[PDB]
């Protein structure tokens, strides 16, 4: 008795390998595609072509909830970038066709669900498609900065992110027609004290890409293959005191002597 | 040889199957020659996209000339851009004692009004059903006679057509398949576990030669796809078989697995050849054996460190997204 | 054109013996264009068989070539002088020994196992990104028999053989080991290039010494400890 | 890189492992095993088994002379 000769003429379909544990519910699979920007973005991302260095790819947000004012729950999250696999070895998708409630009795494993029906005629298996294009997330996540307690970031999120008209009027009416102190800290304008911030912080907003490389660099503790030595202890502490006497006085009061690393 | 792939498909969902009316009368005026419901309007368009996605598309389509069958092939003919021919030989079955009468199908001249440019007349029928209806024995003999004549007409009327689509009826589909395989009667099972050719709404089969003119009567046909219905948003419905007494139309916990064929290098892609066939044994075991064309393979059961989502609607209101998590990684095997 | 298998075998014979595709001499074997159609057809052909097909050709050639030398069906000087005609005639005369149909499977799992005793078988940024995207990370749920004791004991023979050959009237550690196993291990080490053999003196190949000398940088750890 | 030389060592090992050597002999010959005579008032030593076999065969010849 020969084993059934199934077709491989089948449709070729795209795939997405998420570095997430997506449960079987519609709510879960829906939330997962929303983290990538919706089904339009995912389908478009499979159609990108050209040198891998240039591909914009798909952007994944690990935090993407929405607050009561409709603003993003984590404005500023730099995304995990995914790209199409350059050479995806083709694989066949098989449909396994169990009786109702077989999967749960087998601790949700398909292996055990096959083995627990070894002699049955009910358990159909058939090939359904070949996959030959896949997006994988594989580069590191960028440096993340938290703006939850930065005064100007809260004013921006609660206006330009919420689209609330009361907040938007209050915001634009507060923007000076001309700024007389562009040299001074923005905290002098934004009075709000509900947030702990030091006056040494200028509320400088963070850049859209901090790690200019998605993969770790090859330092490997190797040097690249491609004079204070004469000074006295008093001369060295005097040079430090030229910029800040506090560190110089602290050093003189504590240290016993310099050493050249030779 | 020219004809090397035969496709057979059941017509769409009939208007008389709905839970409530008003049920529309046959526009062709012939008894029981009813129109396709909205389910048939959608599902015939699905099958057109599905056949367009396969890298082995038909080059000619033969309809049983009933209105429901020609209506089913109309979107196929439009979207695939292929010629349609009548063939009454693949016609419906009616038992001899049918009341009030045995219906006879409409002709090209009137069908041309309902199907302008879709249908074509450069093919007369290979043979035709008895006007007094048919016993199941005479019915099966009709299909047994049909096949060796039909292919010898197709391969001479057309010089190079290799793949053909038949659009037809539940009894006809099963009888055509069983006779193409050569069984003594169409009520037999394909195997001792009791499988039969399925025949639900829009259900499709594929028959192919195993791996100069050789008689069609000498060639052996393999049933390589046997009631494929994945491309239907409502799945297979209204399934029927010769075990049913009545004439046709009057809990499945599915999971998905990926079988991967990793190549021993990163700068290259493992490609599955176009005309290949899959066989397996032992999925119940920790080392299943798989055939993919010329090469044998042995697996290993593995769980993915993440979740893989596949989008079948995105082939080369709702998406049929598959979750993939268990995998069978295939290592090569040397026969000894 | 029909000699495409002769071209594939000539690429295998040259790249296996001389470590490179000796195109200059291959051109003198099967008459074709000066390099171009040979190089184009070879390059087109390999992509249809991949690394899996290449290994099938290499493993078969290695097996035929050791059997041929074991039975003296060629004189070693003809291999060194690269007599492609004789070398290709070796595979030719060996392929005449067997024939088969493309395989098939039985529906019962056990029946296949009864019928057949099937045999199992640093770079730039963009190259790292390419490689890292192709890999799949998977947790093994099950496989073939573990066979741990035989594998462990076989590796214990590797340990004891290596521990002899690395520096220096009895051996104690192999006393309890079956006398049949030692043959397999010394043979495997020869195939894996780990050993050489004078008329009755084994020696380790420089790979074991060099891997220890390069990866075992203890003189540097000594400097780090002082610092 | 020494491919024909490696084939020569490999096939020569396979020949010698068929020429009655247990493999453990090739190990023992590196480890320091000299063979030694066992006959009455003989004590001579050999660094290969063939030379030991010849020496014991010379003792069989001595028994035949006697
Ligand atoms: Zn002696």
* CATH number for the domain harbouring residue B104: 3.40.50.1240
Q: Give which of C208, C145, C155, C148 is closest to C181, Cα–Cα.
A: C155
DSSP A20-52: S---SSHHHHHHHHHHTT-HHHHHHHTT--S-T
Alpha carbons within 13 angstroms on the beta-carbon side of residue B173 total 30
What is the resolution of the experimental data for this entry, in Å? Answer: 3.8
Query: With an 8 Å Cβ cutoff, is D22 touching chain C?
Result: yes
Collect all residues with Cβ–Cβ distance below 8 Å to C155 and sequence separation of at least 6: none
Inspect the interface and report whether the beta carbons of D4 and C182 lie closer than 8 Å: no
A109 contacts in chain C (CB < 8 Å): 141
Which value, in Å, is the radius of gyration of the alpha carbons in chain D? 16
**Closest-CA distance of chain C to residue A3, Å:** 4
Structure tokens at C126: 């963009």
What does DSSP say about strands B252-260 and A91-99: parallel, antiparallel, or unpaired?
antiparallel
Structure tokens at C161: 């053989």
Chain breaks in chain D (C to N over 2.5 A) after: none
Q: How many residues does chain A have?
A: 262
Alpha carbons within 13 angstroms on the beta-carbon side of residue C126 total 7
Q: Do residues D37 and C192 lie in contact, with contact meaning Cβ atoms separated by under 8 Å?
A: no
Measured between CA atoms, the residue of chain C closest to residue D18 is: C183
Q: Distance between CA C174 and CA B119 in Å, rounded?
A: 84
DSSP A114-151: HHTTTT-SS-EEEEEEEEEEEEEE-SPPPP----TT-H
Structure tokens at B223: 């049933």
Chains B and C share 3 or more Cβ pairs within 8 Å? yes
Inspect the interface and report whether the beta carbons of C183 and D23 lie closer than 8 Å: yes
C183-189 long-range Cβ contacts below 8 angstroms, 24+ apart: C183/D17, C183/D22, C183/D23, C184/C154, C185/C154, C185/C157, C185/C158, C185/C161, C186/C161, C186/D13, C186/D17, C186/D23, C186/D26, C186/D27, C187/D13, C187/D14, C187/D17, C189/C158, C189/C161
Alpha carbons within 13 angstroms on the beta-carbon side of residue A130 total 24
Residues 14-73 of C with CB under 8 A from D: 16-19, 65-66, 69-70
Q: Distance between CA B108 and CA B85 in Å, rounded?
A: 10
3-class state of residue A159 by DSSP:
helix
What does DSSP say about strands D35-36 and B277-281: parallel, antiparallel, or unpaired?
unpaired
Q: Distance between CA C82 and CA C25 in Å, rounded?
A: 9
Q: Do residues D34 and C169 lie in contact, with contact meaning Cβ atoms separated by under 8 Å?
A: yes
The phi and psi torsions of C58 (rounded to 5 degrees) equal -65, -45
Inspect the interface and report whether the beta carbons of C121 and B287 lie closer than 8 Å: no
Q: Do residues B147 and B183 lie in contact, with contact meaning Cβ atoms separated by under 8 Å?
A: no
Q: How many residues does chain D have?
A: 66
Q: Distance between CA B183 and CA B175 in Å, rounded?
A: 10
Q: Distance between CA C121 and CA A45 in Å, rounded?
A: 37
A212-217 long-range Cβ contacts below 8 angstroms, 24+ apart: A213/C125, A214/A81, A214/A139, A214/A140, A214/C129, A215/A139, A215/A140, A215/C125, A215/C128, A215/C129, A215/C132, A216/A140
Structure tokens at B76: 């196929």
Intra-chain end-to-end CA distance of chain D, in Å = 57
3-class state of residue C63 by DSSP:
helix
- The maximal CA–CA distance of chain C, rounded, in angstroms, is 70
The phi and psi torsions of B195 (rounded to 5 degrees) equal -70, 145
Structure tokens at A239: 């040079």
Q: Distance between CA B330 and CA B272 in Å, rounded?
A: 13
Collect all residues with Cβ–Cβ distance below 8 Å to A178 and sequence separation of at least 6: none
Report angle CA C72, C73, C79 to the nearest 5 degrees. 90
Q: Give which of A104, C113, A197 is closest to B286, Cα–Cα.
A: C113
Measured between CA atoms, the residue of chain C closest to residue D30 is: C201
Q: Do residues D35 and D45 lie in contact, with contact meaning Cβ atoms separated by under 8 Å?
A: yes
Only one residue has tokens 């009137």, namely B110
Q: Give which of C18, C17, C15, C38 is closest to C27, Cα–Cα.
A: C38
Inspect the interface and report whether the beta carbons of C143 and B336 lie closer than 8 Å: no
Q: Is B273 left (phi over 0), alpha (psi -120 to 50) or beta?
A: beta
3-class state of residue A6 by DSSP:
strand
Residue B103 Cα to ligand 1 middle (Å): 111
Alpha carbons within 13 angstroms on the beta-carbon side of residue A157 total 21
Report how far apart, in Å, the C-alpha atoms of B43 and of each of A10, B74, B285, B311, D61 are. Answer: 18, 12, 38, 19, 99
Chains D and A share 3 or more Cβ pairs within 8 Å? no
Report how far apart, in Å, the C-alpha atoms of B18 and of each of B37, B47, B71, B92, B239 are. Answer: 8, 21, 18, 21, 15
Note the Cα D41 to chain centre separation in Å.
Answer: 22
Intra-chain end-to-end CA distance of chain C, in Å = 69
Which value, in Å, is the radius of gyration of the alpha carbons in chain A? 30
Q: Do residues B330 and B299 lie in contact, with contact meaning Cβ atoms separated by under 8 Å?
A: yes
Chains C and D share 3 or more Cβ pairs within 8 Å? yes
Q: Distance between CA B140 and CA B179 in Å, rounded?
A: 8
**Closest-CA distance of chain A to residue B226, Å:** 9
Report how far apart, in Å, the C-alpha atoms of B260 and of each of B175, B255, C135, D64 are. Answer: 37, 17, 12, 73
Q: Distance between CA B221 and CA C56 in Å, rounded?
A: 32
Q: Distance between CA B36 and CA B23 in Å, rounded?
A: 11
Chains B, C: CB pairs < 8 Å: 104
- DSSP letter (8 states) at residue C203: E
What does DSSP say about strands A124-137 and A12-18: parallel, antiparallel, or unpaired?
parallel
Q: Distance between CA B66 and CA D48 in Å, rounded?
A: 94
Structure tokens at C99: 């024939």
Q: Distance between CA A130 and CA C185 in Å, rounded?
A: 42
Residue C200 Cα to ligand 1 middle (Å): 22
D7 contacts in chain C (CB < 8 Å): 65-66, 69
- DSSP letter (8 states) at residue A229: G
Q: Distance between CA C161 and CA C154 in Å, rounded?
A: 11
Q: Do residues B253 and A110 lie in contact, with contact meaning Cβ atoms separated by under 8 Å?
A: no
List subunits contacting chain A, requiring 3 or more Cβ pairs under 8 Å: B, C
Other CB atoms within 10 Å distance of the CB of residue C170? 8
Note the Cα A159 to chain centre separation in Å.
Answer: 24
Handedness of CA A241, A243, A244, A250 (dihedral sign): negative
Q: Distance between CA C191 and CA C87 in Å, rounded?
A: 21
Q: Distance between CA B159 and CA B108 in Å, rounded?
A: 24
The phi and psi torsions of C141 (rounded to 5 degrees) equal -90, -40
Handedness of CA A130, A132, A138, A141 (dihedral sign): negative
B143-149 long-range Cβ contacts below 8 angstroms, 24+ apart: B143/B172, B143/B175, B143/B176, B143/B179, B144/B179, B146/B89, B146/B90, B146/B176, B146/B179, B147/B176, B147/B179, B147/B180, B147/B216, B148/B216, B148/B217
Q: Distance between CA A242 and CA A248 in Å, rounded?
A: 9
Structure tokens at C189: 């080490």
Residue A72 Cα to ligand 1 middle (Å): 96
Best mutation target, A18, A48, A85, A107, to test chain C (most C CBs within 10 A): A85
Collect all residues with Cβ–Cβ distance below 8 Å to A237 and sequence separation of at least 6: A248, A251, A252
3-class state of residue A95 by DSSP:
strand
Query: With an 8 Å Cβ cutoff, is D45 touching chain C?
Result: no
Element (DSSP H or E) covering residue C137: none
Q: Do residues B240 and B170 lie in contact, with contact meaning Cβ atoms separated by under 8 Å?
A: yes
Query: With an 8 Å Cβ cutoff, is A12 touching chain B?
Result: yes
Q: Distance between CA B56 and CA B277 in Å, rounded?
A: 13
Element (DSSP H or E) covering residue C26: helix C23-26
Angle between helices C36-47 and C50-70 (to 10 degrees): 110
Structure tokens at C162: 């290596």
Q: Distance between CA C177 and CA C197 in Å, rounded?
A: 22
Structure tokens at B199: 């025949």
C133 contacts in chain A (CB < 8 Å): 83, 85-86, 136, 138
DSSP A162-211: T--HHHHHHHHHHS-SS-S-TTS-GGGT----SS---TT---PPPPS-S-
Element (DSSP H or E) covering residue A237: helix A233-243
According to DSSP, the residues that pair with A80 across neighbouring strands are A60
Other CB atoms within 10 Å distance of the CB of residue B53? 18
What are the residues whose beta carbon lies below 5 Å from ligand 1 (ion)?
D 37, 39, 42
Residues B65-97: b if buried by 16+ CB within 10 A, e if exposed:
bbbbbbbbbbbbbeebebebbbbbbbbbbbeee
- DSSP letter (8 states) at residue C103: P
In SS3 terms, chain B reads as CCCCEEEEEECCCEHHHCCCCCCCCCCCCCCCCCCECHHHHHHHHHHHHHHHHCCCCCCEEEECCCHHHHHHHHHHHHHHCCCEEECHHHCCCCCCCCCCCCCCCCCHHHHHHHCCCCEECCCCCCCCCCCCCCCHHHHHHHHHHHHHHHHHHHHHHCCCCCEEEEEECHHHHHHHHHHHHCCCCCCCCCCCCCCCCCCCCCCEEEEEECCCCCCCCCCCEEEEEEEECCCCCCCCCCCCCCCCCCCCCCCEEEEEEEEECCCCCCCCCCCCCCCCEEEEECCCCCCCEEEECCEEEECCEEEEEEEEEECHHHCCCCCCCEEEEEEEECEEEECC
Other CB atoms within 10 Å distance of the CB of residue B23? 13
A215-220 long-range Cβ contacts below 8 angstroms, 24+ apart: A215/A139, A215/A140, A215/C125, A215/C128, A215/C129, A215/C132, A216/A140
Q: Say what the alpha-carbon torsion angle A98, A101, A106, A112 is, to the nearest 10 degrees.
A: 0
- For residue B117, the enclosing domain spans 5-228
DSSP D8-45: HHHHHHHHHHHTT--SHHHHHHHHT--EE--STT---E
Q: How many residues does chain C have?
A: 227
What does DSSP say about strands A12-18 and B119-120: parallel, antiparallel, or unpaired?
unpaired
Collect all residues with Cβ–Cβ distance below 8 Å to B233 and sequence separation of at least 6: B42, B43, B46, B318, B320
3-class state of residue A108 by DSSP:
coil
Q: Do residues A89 and B263 lie in contact, with contact meaning Cβ atoms separated by under 8 Å?
A: yes
- DSSP letter (8 states) at residue C105: -
Q: How many residues does chain B have?
A: 336
3-class state of residue A96 by DSSP:
strand
Q: Give which of B258, B256, B260, B238 is closest to B320, Cα–Cα.
A: B256
Query: With an 8 Å Cβ cutoff, is C220 touching chain D?
Result: no
Q: Give which of A62, A103, A66 is closest to A81, Cα–Cα.
A: A62
Q: Distance between CA A154 and CA A159 in Å, rounded?
A: 8
Element (DSSP H or E) covering residue C68: helix C50-70
Element (DSSP H or E) covering residue C6: helix C4-17
3-class state of residue C16 by DSSP:
helix
Residue D63 Cα to ligand 1 middle (Å): 12
Q: Give which of B146, B205, B140, B207 is closest to B175, Cα–Cα.
A: B140
Residues A221-255: b if buried by 16+ CB within 10 A, e if exposed:
eeeeeeeeeeeeeeebbeebeeeeeeebeeeeeee
Query: With an 8 Å Cβ cutoff, is C197 touching chain D?
Result: yes
Q: Do residues A212 and A139 lie in contact, with contact meaning Cβ atoms separated by under 8 Å?
A: no
């Amino acid at each position: 008795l020969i084993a059934d000769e199934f077709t491989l003429d089948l449709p070729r379909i795209p795939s997405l390998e998420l570095p997430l544990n997506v449960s079987t519910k519609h709510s879960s699979i829906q939330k997962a595609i929303k983290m990538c920007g919706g089904i339009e973005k995912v389908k478009e991302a499979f159609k990108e072509h050209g040198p891998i260095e240039s591909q914009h790819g798909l952007q994944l947000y690990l935090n993407d909830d929405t607050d009561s004012d409709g603003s993003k729950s984590y404005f500023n999250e730099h995304p995990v970038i995914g790209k199409r696999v350059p050479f995806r070895d083709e694989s066949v998708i098989l449909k396994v066709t169990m009786p109702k409630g077989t999967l749960s009795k087998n601790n949700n494993s398909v292996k055990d669900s096959i083995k627990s029906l070894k002699d049955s005629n009910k358990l159909r298996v058939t090939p359904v498609s070949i996959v030959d294009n896949t997006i994988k997330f594989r580069e590191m996540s960028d440096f993340q900065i938290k703006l939850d307690n930065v005064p100007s970031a809260r004013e921006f999120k609660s206006s330009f992110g919420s689209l609330e008209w009361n907040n938007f009027k209050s915001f634009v009416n507060s923007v000076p027609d001309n700024d007389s102190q562009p040299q001074e800290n923005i905290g002098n304008l934004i009075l709000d004290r509900s947030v702990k911030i030091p006056s040494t912080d200028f509320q400088l907003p963070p850049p859209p890409k901090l790690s200019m490389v998605g993969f770790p660099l090859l330092y490997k503790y190797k040097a690249n293959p491609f004079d204070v030595k004469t000074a006295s202890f008093q001369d060295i502490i005097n040079k430090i005191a030229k910029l800040d006497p506090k560190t110089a006085e602290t050093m003189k009061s504590e240290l016993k002597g310099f050493v050249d690393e030779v | 040889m020219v004809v090397n792939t035969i496709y057979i498909a059941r017509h769409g969902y009939r208007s008389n199957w709905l839970p409530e009316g008003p049920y529309p009368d046959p526009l062709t005026g012939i008894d029981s020659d009813v129109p396709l419901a909205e389910h048939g309007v959608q599902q015939a368009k699905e099958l057109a996209h599905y056949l367009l996605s396969l890298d082995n598309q038909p080059e000619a389509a033969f309809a049983s000339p009933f209105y429901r069958c020609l209506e089913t092939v109309q979107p196929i003919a439009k979207l695939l851009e292929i010629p349609v021919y009548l063939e009454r030989g693949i016609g419906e079955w009616y038992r001899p004692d049918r009341k009030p009468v045995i219906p006879v199908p409409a002709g090209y001249e009137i069908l041309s009004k309902f199907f302008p440019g879709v249908i074509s007349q450069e093919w007369d029928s290979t043979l035709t059903p008895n006007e007094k209806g048919e016993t199941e024995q005479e019915m099966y003999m009709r299909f047994k006679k049909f096949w060796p004549l039909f292919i010898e007409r197709v391969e001479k009327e057309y010089p190079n057509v290799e793949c053909i689509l038949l659009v037809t009826h539940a009894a006809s589909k099963i009888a055509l398949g069983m006779s193409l395989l050569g069984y003594d009667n169409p009520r037999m099972s394909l195997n001792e576990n009791g499988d039969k050719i399925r025949s639900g709404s829009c259900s499709l089969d594929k028959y192919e030669i195993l791996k100069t003119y050789i008689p069609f009567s000498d060639r052996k046909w393999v049933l390589t796809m046997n009631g494929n219905t994945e491309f239907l948003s409502s799945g297979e419905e209204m399934n029927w078989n010769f075990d049913c007494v009545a004439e046709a139309g009057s809990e499945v916990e599915t999971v998905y697995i990926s079988v991967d064929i990793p190549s021993g290098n990163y700068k290259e892609r493992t490609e599955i050849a176009k005309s290949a066939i899959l066989q397996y044994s032992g999925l119940e075991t920790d080392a299943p054996l798989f055939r993919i064309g010329n090469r044998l393979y042995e697996g290993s059961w593995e769980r993915l460190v993440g979740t893989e989502l596949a989008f079948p609607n995105a082939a080369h209101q709702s998406e049929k997204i598959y979750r993939i998590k268990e995998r069978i990684v295939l290592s090569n095997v040397r026969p000894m | 054109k029909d000699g495409v298998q002769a071209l594939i075998r000539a690429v295998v014979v040259t790249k296996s013996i001389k470590n490179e595709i000796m195109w200059d001499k291959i051109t003198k074997l099967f008459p074709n264009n000066s390099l171009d159609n040979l190089k184009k057809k070879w390059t087109a052909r390999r992509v249809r068989m991949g690394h899996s097909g290449w290994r099938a050709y290499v493993d078969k050639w290695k097996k035929m070539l050791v059997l041929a030398i074991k039975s003296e069906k060629i004189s070693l000087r003809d291999v060194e002088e690269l007599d492609l005609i004789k070398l290709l005639d070796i595979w030719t005369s060996f392929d005449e020994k067997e024939i088969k149909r493309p395989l098939f499977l039985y529906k019962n799992y056990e029946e296949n196992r009864k019928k057949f005793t099937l045999v199992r078988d640093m770079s730039s940024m963009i190259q790292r990104e390419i490689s890292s995207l192709k890999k799949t990370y998977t947790r093994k749920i099950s496989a073939s028999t573990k066979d741990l004791s035989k594998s462990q004991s076989d590796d214990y023979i590797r340990t004891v053989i290596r521990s002899i050959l690395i520096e220096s009237n009895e051996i104690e550690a192999l006393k309890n080991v079956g006398n049949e196993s030692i043959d397999n291990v010394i043979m495997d080490m020869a195939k894996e290039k780990q050993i050489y053999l004078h008329g009755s003196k084994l020696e380790c190949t420089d790979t074991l010494p060099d891997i220890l000398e390069n990866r075992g940088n203890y003189k540097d750890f000594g400097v780090a400890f002082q610092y | 890189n020494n491919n024909v030389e490696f084939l020569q060592n490999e096939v020569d090992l396979e020949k010698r492992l068929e020429s009655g050597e247990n493999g453990l002999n090739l190990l023992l010959n590196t480890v320091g095993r000299k063979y030694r005579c066992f006959y009455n008032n003989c004590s001579r030593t050999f660094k290969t088994k063939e030379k030991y076999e010849k020496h014991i065969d010379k003792h069989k010849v001595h028994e035949l002379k006697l």
